[PDB]
Amino acid sequence: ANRFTANIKGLTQASRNANDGISIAQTTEGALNEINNNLQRVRELAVQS
Amino acid sequence: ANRFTANIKGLTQASRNANDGISIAQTTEGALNEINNNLQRVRELAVQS
């Protein structure tokens, strides 16, 4: 029972760890989207030029 | 999707460029019409001379 308690604790915390990982991935994607939009506008300008 | 979008924007701007090209070409041709006519008149005048 003691060992099971230990494992339950560990995996329980690991769940929220992975959650935070998801969060950081989300934020990085959010920034990259706007970066892409800016670059596409730049390509518009380039073809114009 | 990103490449398709970039291509679409480029092609639209290129369409505008083509419109500019036709405009300039037809402007020059319009002027050339009167120029040629004037040379024809000069030919008539010299032949009369």
Among candidate residues B32, B26, B49, B6, the one with its CA nearest the CA of residue A47: B6
- In whole angstroms, what is the distance from residue B20 CA to residue B10 CA? 15
Q: How was this structure determined?
A: cryo-EM
A40, closest residue in chain B (CA to CA): B6
Distance CA A44, CA B5 (A): 11
Please say whether the beta carbons of A40 and B13 come within 8 A.
Answer: no
| Alpha-helical regions (H) of B1-49 | 2-48
Report how far residue B10's alpha carbon sits from residue A47's, in angstroms, rounded to the nearest whole number: 6
Gaps in chain A (C to N over 2.5 angstroms) fall after none
Kindly state the tokens that stand for B19: 């419109």
Q: How far apart are CA A36 and CA B5, in angstroms?
A: 11
List, as ranges, residues 1-40 from B with C-beta within 8 Å of A.
Answer: 2, 5-6, 9-10, 13-14
Q: Nearest-CA neighbor of A3 among A28, A37, B20, A11?
A: A11
Sequence-ordered list of residues with C-beta below 8 angstroms from that of B5, at least 6 positions apart, any chain: A40
